[PDB]
Amino acid sequence: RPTFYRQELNKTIWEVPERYQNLSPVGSGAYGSVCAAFDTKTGHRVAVKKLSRPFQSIIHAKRTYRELRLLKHMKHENVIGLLDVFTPARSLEEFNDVYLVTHLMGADLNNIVKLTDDHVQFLIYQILRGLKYIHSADIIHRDLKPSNLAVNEDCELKILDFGLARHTDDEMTGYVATRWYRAPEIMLNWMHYNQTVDIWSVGCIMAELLTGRTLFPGTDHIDQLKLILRLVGTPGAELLKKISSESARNYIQSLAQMPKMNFANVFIGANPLAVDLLEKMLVLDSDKRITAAQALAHAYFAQYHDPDDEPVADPYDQSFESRDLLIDEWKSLTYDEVISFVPPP
Numbered sequence: 001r002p003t004f005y006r007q008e009l010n011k012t013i014w015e016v017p018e019r020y021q022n023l024s025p026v027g028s029g030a031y032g033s034v035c036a037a038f039d040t041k042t043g044h045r046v047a048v049k050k051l052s053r054p055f056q057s058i059i060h061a062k063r064t065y066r067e068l069r070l071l072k073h074m075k076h077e078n079v080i081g082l083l084d085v086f087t088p089a090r091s092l093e094e095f096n097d098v099y100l101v102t103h104l105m106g107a108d109l110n111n112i113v114k115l116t117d118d119h120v121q122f123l124i125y126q127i128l129r130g131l132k133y134i135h136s137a138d139i140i141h142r143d144l145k146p147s148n149l150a151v152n153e154d155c156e157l158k159i160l161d162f163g164l165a166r167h168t169d170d171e172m173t174g175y176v177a178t179r180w181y182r183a184p185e186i187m188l189n190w191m192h193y194n195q196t197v198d199i200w201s202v203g204c205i206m207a208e209l210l211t212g213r214t215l216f217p218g219t220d221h222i223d224q225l226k227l228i229l230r231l232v233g234t235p236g237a238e239l240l241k242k243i244s245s246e247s248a249r250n251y252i253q254s255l256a257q258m259p260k261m262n263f264a265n266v267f268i269g270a271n272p273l274a275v276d277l278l279e280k281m282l283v284l285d286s287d288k289r290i291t292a293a294q295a296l297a298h299a300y301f302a303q304y305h306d307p308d309d310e311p312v313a314d315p316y317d318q319s320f321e322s323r324d325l326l327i328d329e330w331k332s333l334t335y336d337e338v339i340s341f342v343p344p345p
C-alpha cells in the first residue's frame with residue numbers, strides 16, 4: 001500500500017499516493033474534478049480525476065461501476081486507457097472516494113481545427129482504427145464529436161468521453177454542438193439503435209475537416225432533420241417500415257419528397273475517394289452504412305491501411321447492465337475492481 005498525502009485544491013480535499021506530485025486544477029465537468037500532475041513512477045504528465053458523489057444513488061453507483069469497467073477494458077493506441085485507479089480507504093467499510101489516472105490530454109480536434117488531404121486521411125484513419133476496436137467488444141460510443149477527440153503535435157489521435165447514457169434533454173436543445181454529430185434515428189428516437197450510429201458521427205467529422213464548416217448546424221432537432229434530408233434525401237418505404245413510432249412515421253410522410261444531392265457538388269474540390277467514402281457513411285438507413293472494419297479497407301486510406309496492425313478487443317461482459325442491485329452491492333463491485341487493477345507494462 002502506498003503512502004498517501006492530503007491537500008485542499010480549489011475548495012476540495014485530495015488524498016493521493018506520493019508518486020503523484022505538483023497537482024494543479026485543470027477541469028470542471030459534472031462527473032468529477034481534474035488535476036494535472038507529474039507521475040514520478042512512469043515520468044508522464046498525467047490527469048488525476050476525483051469522482052464527485054460516486055455512490056449518492058443506485059443510478060450514480062451503477063454509472064461509477066460502468067465507467068470503471070469500461071476504462072479498465074480499453075487497451076488501444078487510439079483510445080483513452082487507464083494508467084492507475086486508487087482509493088485512500090483501507091477497507092470496504094470506509095470506502096467513499098475513487099480517483100482515475102490517464103495520460104494528460106492537451107488539444108482536442110477543435111483546437112487543431114489549415115489541413116491537407118493527407119491530414120484528413122491520417123486523422124479519420126485513427127478514429128476508424130480505434131472504432132473497429134471499440135465495436136469488436138460490442139461497445140457503442142454514442143457521442144463522437146471533435147471535443148471528444150484528443151490530438152497531439154504529431155497529429156496522433158485518441159477517442160475519449162464514452163457516452164455513459166448521461167446526456168440530458170436540456171443539453172440537446174437548440175443551436176448546440178452536443179446534437180450536430182448525432183444520427184437521426186437516435187436524435188428523434190425512431191428505433192432501437194446500434195453501433196452504426198458512430199459511423200454517421202465520423203462522416204459529420206470528416207466533412208467538417210474537409211470544408212472547415214459544421215455539416216448539419218441545426219437551430220433545433222427539426223431544423224437539423226431538414227438539413228440532413230436535403231443532403232441524403234427523404235426516406236423510401238423500406239426505411240419508413242423500420243421506424244417503430246407511428247407519430248415519427250406520420251411526421252416524416254408530411255415532408256415533400258427530396259432526392260439525394262450530388263456530393264461532388266457539395267464537397268467541391270475534395271479528393272474523389274473522400275467524396276465516395278462520405279456517400280458510404282452518410283446513409284439514412286443505418287443497416288446500409290459502411291462498418292469501421294470495411295472503411296479501413298477503402299482506397300482513401302491506402303497509404304495507412306495495414307491489416308496486421310488494426311487489432312480487435314478482448315471479449316467484454318456487460319451482463320451487469322440488466323442486473324438490479326442495491327447501492328452497497330454496486331459499491332462493493334466497484335471496490336473489487338479498484339483493488340484488482342493491474343497497471344500496464
Ligand SMILES: OCc1ccc(-n2cnc3ccccc32)cc1
Nearest residue numbers: 026027034047049102103104105
Ligand atoms: O473520466 C475519465 C477521464 C476523462 C478525461 C480525462 N482527461 C485526460 N486529460 C485531461 C485533460 C483535461 C481534462 C480532462 C482530462 C481523464 C479521465
Ligand SMILES: [Cl-]
Nearest residue numbers: 002017018019
Ligand atoms: Cl507512492
Ligand SMILES: [Cl-]
Nearest residue numbers: 079080081103
Ligand atoms: Cl492513453
Ligand SMILES: [Cl-]
Nearest residue numbers: 089095096097
Ligand atoms: Cl475513501
Ligand SMILES: [Cl-]
Nearest residue numbers: 145146147177
Ligand atoms: Cl464538439
Ligand SMILES: [Cl-]
Nearest residue numbers: 315316317318
Ligand atoms: Cl469482460
